[PDB]
Amino acid sequence: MWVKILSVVGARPQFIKAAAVSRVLRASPGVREVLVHTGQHYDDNMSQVFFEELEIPDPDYHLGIGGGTHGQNTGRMLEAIEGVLLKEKPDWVLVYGDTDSTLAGALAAVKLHIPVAHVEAGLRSFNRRMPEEINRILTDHASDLLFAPTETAVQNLLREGIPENRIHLVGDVMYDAALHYGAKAERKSRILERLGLQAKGYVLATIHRAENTDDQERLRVILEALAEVHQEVPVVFPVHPRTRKRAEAFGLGSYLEKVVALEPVGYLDMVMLEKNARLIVTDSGGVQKEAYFYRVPCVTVREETEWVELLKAEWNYLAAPQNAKDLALTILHRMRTKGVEIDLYGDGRASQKISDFLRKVGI
Amino acid sequence: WVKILSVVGARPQFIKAAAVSRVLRASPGVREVLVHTGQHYDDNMSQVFFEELEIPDPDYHLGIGGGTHGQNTGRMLEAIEGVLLKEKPDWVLVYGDTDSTLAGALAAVKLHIPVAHVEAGLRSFNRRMPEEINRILTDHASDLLFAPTETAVQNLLREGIPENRIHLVGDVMYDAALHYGAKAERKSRILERLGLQAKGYVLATIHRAENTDDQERLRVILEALAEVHQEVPVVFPVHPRTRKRAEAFGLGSYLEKVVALEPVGYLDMVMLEKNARLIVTDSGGVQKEAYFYRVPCVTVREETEWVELLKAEWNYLAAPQNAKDLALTILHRMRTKGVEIDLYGDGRASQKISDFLR
Numbered sequence: 204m205w206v207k208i209l210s211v212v213g214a215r216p217q218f219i220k221a222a223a224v225s226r227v228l229r230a231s232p233g234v235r236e237v238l239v240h241t242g243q244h245y246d247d248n249m250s251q252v253f254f255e256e257l258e259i260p261d262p263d264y265h266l267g268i269g270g271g272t273h274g275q276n277t278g279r280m281l282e283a284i285e286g287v288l289l290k291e292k293p294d295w296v297l298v299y300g301d302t303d304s305t306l307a308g309a310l311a312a313v314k315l316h317i318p319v320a321h322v323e324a325g326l327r328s329f330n331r332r333m334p335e336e337i338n339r340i341l342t343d344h345a346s347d348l349l350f351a352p353t354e355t356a357v358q359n360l361l362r363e364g365i366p367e368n369r370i371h372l373v374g375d376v377m378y379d380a381a382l383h384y385g386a387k388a389e390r391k392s393r394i395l396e397r398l399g400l401q402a403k404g405y406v407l408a409t410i411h412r413a414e415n416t417d418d419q420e421r422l423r424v425i426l427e428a429l430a431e432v433h434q435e436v437p438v439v440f441p442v443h444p445r446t447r448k449r450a451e452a453f454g455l456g457s458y459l460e461k462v463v464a465l466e467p468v469g470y471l472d473m474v475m476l477e478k479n480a481r482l483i484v485t486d487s488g489g490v491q492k493e494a495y496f497y498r499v500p501c502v503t504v505r506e507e508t509e510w511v512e513l514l515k516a517e518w519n520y521l522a523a524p525q526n527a528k529d530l531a532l533t534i535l536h537r538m539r540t541k542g543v544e545i546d547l548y549g550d551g552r553a554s555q556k557i558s559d560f561l562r563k564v565g566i
Numbered sequence: 567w568v569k570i571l572s573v574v575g576a577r578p579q580f581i582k583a584a585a586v587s588r589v590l591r592a593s594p595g596v597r598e599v600l601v602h603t604g605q606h607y608d609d610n611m612s613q614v615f616f617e618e619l620e621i622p623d624p625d626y627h628l629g630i631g632g633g634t635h636g637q638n639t640g641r642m643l644e645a646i647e648g649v650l651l652k653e654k655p656d657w658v659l660v661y662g663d664t665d666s667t668l669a670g671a672l673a674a675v676k677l678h679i680p681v682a683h684v685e686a687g688l689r690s691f692n693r694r695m696p697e698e699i700n701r702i703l704t705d706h707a708s709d710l711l712f713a714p715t716e717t718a719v720q721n722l723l724r725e726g727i728p729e730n731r732i733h734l735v736g737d738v739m740y741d742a743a744l745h746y747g748a749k750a751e752r753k754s755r756i757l758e759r760l761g762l763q764a765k766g767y768v769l770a771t772i773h774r775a776e777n778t779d780d781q782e783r784l785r786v787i788l789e790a791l792a793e794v795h796q797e798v799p800v801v802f803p804v805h806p807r808t809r810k811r812a813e814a815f816g817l818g819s820y821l822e823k824v825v826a827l828e829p830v831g832y833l834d835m836v837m838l839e840k841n842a843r844l845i846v847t848d849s850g851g852v853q854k855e856a857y858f859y860r861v862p863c864v865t866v867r868e869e870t871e872w873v874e875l876l877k878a879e880w881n882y883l884a885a886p887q888n889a890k891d892l893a894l895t896i897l898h899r900m901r902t903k904g905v906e907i908d909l910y911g912d913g914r915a916s917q918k919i920s921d922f923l924r
């Protein structure tokens with residue numbers, strides 16, 4: 204009954220998913236966990252704070268890979284992860300989400316015949332210019348187990364020819380995380396006090412996607428829209444490090460001063476900011492869902508989302524950044540809104556469902 | 567004019583690329599760029615194809631190979647992208663199903679460079695085969711899928727890939743046989759060199775890992791071929807890895823018993839194929855080629871991706887479970903043939919491909 208299960212994680216949102224899962228595997232008797240941190244997120248506010256606050260053991264391995272092209276990053280990680288797998292020889296490799304790390308892990312494993320399970324499988328944007336879209340498609344096609352969080356994702360995998368018996372709708376482990384760490388956030392966050400905000404008295408924003416930050420006019424559209432909204436309702440913005448580097452390089456730095464621009468916060472503070480906001484504006488996948496978790500209206504600053512159920516339930520609304528004036532107006536309009544009551548993403552036990560499937564599979 | 571960059575790493579990919587190159591040189595507004603990833607690198611596994619099939623010197627040799635899946639693929643992924651960044655082609659073409667193919671496709675698609683897969687949609691339905699993974703992942707990464715067969719088309723549709731991205735163009739390896747057949751007739755002296763009479767010998771190639779990494783399977787095969795040899799000469803251009811495995815397991819004496827050769831160039835292979843009474847193989851290319859020349863084929867495997875060849879009775883599967891059983895199957899199939907049928911197209915697969923890229 205001694206099974207070794209190795210998780211590959213590279214970034215903040217993967218650390219959070221792995222926490223939810225690791226919490227449950229830690230209670231599985233006879234399961235040894237190994238964690239490989241690939242190196243993409245290394246700053247202590249992007250990485251270690253997740254390990255501390257979320258109670259995750261330090262990574263068994265730090266590969267320290269990041270900062271180059273898709274080829275460099277992905278190719279160096281593929282070779283580096285495979286080296287770990289030949290030594291650790293796990294029974295299962297878990298990969299999470301849709302980064303270059305995810306694919307590099309799936310691909311390292313599948314060629315060694317090591318069973319791979321994709322946590323958060325079958326999400327599609329249908330925009331292959333997104334690197335994440337390639338990553339999750341190829342990942343999914345290389346996996347033995349596909350842990351789908353929604354029915355859309357199930358349907359996506361069936362339509363690409365993947366057999367039912369490898370597909371499991373288990374819900375979203377990020378809902379487990381919100382459920383299980385909520386009380387701890389409540390008890391230990393002092394972020395509202397420290398910023399001097401009260402409930403329903405601000406708007407929360409995050410923005411980090413390449414399409415939005417790698418293009419000067421697009422980024423300007425966003426920051427100027429945020430500064431405008433700030434006039435009517437205060438705007439709290441924990442700026443991703445790369446979003447700060449890009450704003451700076453572009454001369455848009457002045458705009459961050461016109462809002463409540465913070466550094467990245469940890470999960471417990473993030474939970475309290477999200478729970479207590481009037482509205483959340485984001486280009487993050489995870490924040491989209493978490494907005495819904497706390498029944499706070501969301502605007503997503505993208506041309507599409509993989510989380511289509513949120514749009515359909517009216518909790519989310521897309522606003523591509525074409526014009527600052529219009530984007531501000533949309534944000535203020537949507538602050539007045541609410542979606543319909545509905546249960547998405549499961550019961551908070553997606554991680555237990557995952558654990559059960561891993562041990563009782565037949566390897 | 568439009569820039570079309572081809573990634574090739576192995577013998578069969580040089581052959582496929584030869585046929586495609588032949589069309590693209592003659593195309594009005596096409597510049598061709600060629601990347602050799604470095605996977606096959608002897609003269610008899612590489613250079614001989616460039617010389618004999620009139621393939622222009624590659625623009626880049628990456629010189630990668632000989633490591634694990636992780637090493638070869640990751641390093642190819644990094645190096646190929648470096649080339650794509652300099653060259654910025656309009657199309658990337660990848661071929662077959664090796665690690666080179668997947669690395670090429672994945673380098674390109676993240677840079678928004680349209681990828682087209684030459685030989686798309688083949689499936690063994692055994693995902694423990696590395697190339698099965700490679701061609702699945704490649705097909706889902708590509709923009710255009712050049713399928714050689716109906717089965718391949720159906721495989722691609724079943725996986726959700728839209729019919730507007732799927733072109734059944736036949737097989738560029740049929741192009742190559744057709745378009746370099748004369749040349750081979752003119753230049754090849756190998757039958758004479760080896761004292762062989764047309765249709766007085768059997769041709770064998772064996773290189774798949776499931777047959778060469780398993781000592782029992784390889785012994786079964788090499789004993790079977792030695793037995794067959796007693797009835798009708800067996801000629802065997804031995805893949806170098808296959809030689810190494812045979813020597814490693816102590817099976818070198820079975821190679822001595824047949825007419826074992828080193829790998830041969832394509833012109834010699836065409837001549838050996840044409841003129842063989844029967845072909846015994848685990849190669850994908852060679853089983854098709856057997857059919858091209860209406861020579862009965864035995865495939866030493868439990869399945870093949872080329873299922874039409876079994877259906878048409880030109881090919882027959884023979885798993886290497888027992889040396890004498892395998893030999894008897896081989897001798898039995900020598901005096902069979904399959905039905906009249908036209909597979910793999912008319913020899914203008916490459917022309918159809920060229921047209922679609924504009």
Ligand SMILES: CC(=O)N[C@@H]1[C@@H](OP(=O)(O)OP(=O)(O)OC[C@H]2O[C@@H](n3ccc(=O)[nH]c3=O)[C@H](O)[C@@H]2O)O[C@H](C(=O)O)[C@@H](O)[C@@H]1NC(C)=O
Pocket residue numbers: 214215216217219220299300301302323326335377409412441466467468469470471473474486487488489490493509
């Ligand atoms: C490339 C891309 O943008 N793909 C998607 C990407 O995730 P996300 O976009 O959500 O990145 P993030 O926003 O950095 O993190 C969110 C968390 O940080 C917390 N968060 C956020 C800010 C902060 O200051 N502090 C926090 O604790 C929040 O509370 C959240 O819990 O990578 C994910 C992954 O690979 O696993 C994919 O599953 C995912 N795909 C989908 C479809 O949602």
Ligand SMILES: CC(=O)N[C@@H]1[C@@H](OP(=O)(O)OP(=O)(O)OC[C@H]2O[C@@H](n3ccc(=O)[nH]c3=O)[C@H](O)[C@@H]2O)O[C@H](C(=O)O)[C@@H](O)[C@@H]1NC(C)=O
Pocket residue numbers: 576577578579581582661662663664667685688697739771774803804828829830831832833835836848849850851852855871
């Ligand atoms: C992993 C694997 O085995 N994948 C398959 C693999 O092909 P093959 O097995 O045919 O390799 P090979 O036999 O070394 O070369 C044949 C040629 O050599 C010539 N040949 C052969 C021997 C010789 O001594 N001299 C020659 O000129 C012959 O006349 C032939 O023209 O690689 C192909 C590729 O990636 O393009 C895949 O498309 C393919 N997948 C399928 C489905 O067939």
Ligand SMILES: [Cl-]
Pocket residue numbers: 267268269270271279
């Ligand atoms: Cl690096």
Ligand code: NA
Pocket residue numbers: 373374375548549550551552553554556
């Ligand atoms: Na659930």
Ligand code: NA
Pocket residue numbers: 821822823824825826
């Ligand atoms: Na001999």
